[PDB]
Amino acid sequence: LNPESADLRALAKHLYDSYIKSFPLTKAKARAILTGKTTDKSPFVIYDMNSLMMGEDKQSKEVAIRIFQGCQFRSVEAVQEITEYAKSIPGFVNLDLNDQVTLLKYGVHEIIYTMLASLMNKDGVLISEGQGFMTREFLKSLRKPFGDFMEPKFEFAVKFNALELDDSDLAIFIAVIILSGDRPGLLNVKPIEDIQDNLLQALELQLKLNHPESSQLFAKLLQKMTDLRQIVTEHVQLLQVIKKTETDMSLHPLLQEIYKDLY
Amino acid sequence: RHKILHRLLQE
Numbered sequence A: 001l002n003p004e005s006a007d008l009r010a011l012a013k014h015l016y017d018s019y020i021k022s023f024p025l026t027k028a029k030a031r032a033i034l035t036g037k038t039t040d041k042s043p044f045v046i047y048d049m050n051s052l053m054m055g056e057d058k059q060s061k062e063v064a065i066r067i068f069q070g071c072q073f074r075s076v077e078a079v080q081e082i083t084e085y086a087k088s089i090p091g092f093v094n095l096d097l098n099d100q101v102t103l104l105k106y107g108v109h110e111i112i113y114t115m116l117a118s119l120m121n122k123d124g125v126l127i128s129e130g131q132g133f134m135t136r137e138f139l140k141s142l143r144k145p146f147g148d149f150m151e152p153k154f155e156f157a158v159k160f161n162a163l164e165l166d167d168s169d170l171a172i173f174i175a176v177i178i179l180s181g182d183r184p185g186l187l188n189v190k191p192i193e194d195i196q197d198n199l200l201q202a203l204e205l206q207l208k209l210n211h212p213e214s215s216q217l218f219a220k221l222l223q224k225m226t227d228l229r230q231i232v233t234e235h236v237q238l239l240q241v242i243k244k245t246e247t248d249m250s251l252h253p254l255l256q257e258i259y260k261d262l263y
Numbered sequence B: 001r002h003k004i005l006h007r008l009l010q011e
């Protein structure tokens, strides 16, 4: 380790410490729960309408709407965690405030789906800070148009989880996503790109130290960033459909804000 | 626009 490398390690450690502060349920905690290598009670499993209702002891809309709205509420909380984490990224708060807003607006769902993968396996997803586990088959079964809204996320997650990143890798990756110079409408790209270049150097060093076995993990990881955007644009289209067919539904105001003029 | 996001950022 030389001096520029050492600056890269300090950045990596700084981001990891903020990540743990900001995000209550880490991938490490999530993994223990899912394998059962944990000292906690195993989570309550929701595989049908009845288990969902019995689990609600651990409004009265139709179940598909309850579930979709539960997903919204989790994003609302995630946006808050991600915003706090973003503020800890060196140089982020010194950017033009409109640009900070634009980066968050475009970055949050990409981060949400990245981190949701930490909570997933091929059979289901942890919910409510790991107190629950909701089965993938149950989610597929919801009535249209809610029946397939999770499948692109599960599919992304099985591929992404094959990379076996840990929380220290993810902390940096998430920051790289937030500092994307190509977001529509940015006012001053150069200072964002300068920060992203350091973050990317830090990610690459991190991947080489923590995964010396896995050659070109860095390159594989960067290609996932393009897959994430597609998850998001497809999701926007499903929401357009949902808004048209269910006037029962109302979108949380934070989410309206984020989604407005997004793609 | 992005009133909540400003607020969360400026918080």
Ligand SMILES: COc1ccc(Oc2cc(N(C)CCOc3ccc(C[C@@H]4SC(=O)NC4=O)cc3)ncn2)cc1
Binding pocket: A052, A055, A056, A066, A067, A068, A070, A071, A072, A074, A075, A076, A112, A116, A125, A126, A127, A128, A134, A239, A255
């Ligand atoms: C009271 O009993 C219950 C009621 C409901 C319930 O459903 C769930 C499901 C759930 N997941 C499936 C895990 C979280 O998946 C998510 C999926 C999509 C998003 C993106 C959201 S969606 C949108 O359009 N824009 C968004 O930003 C966020 C999270 N998480 C929490 N509750 C379980 C129990």
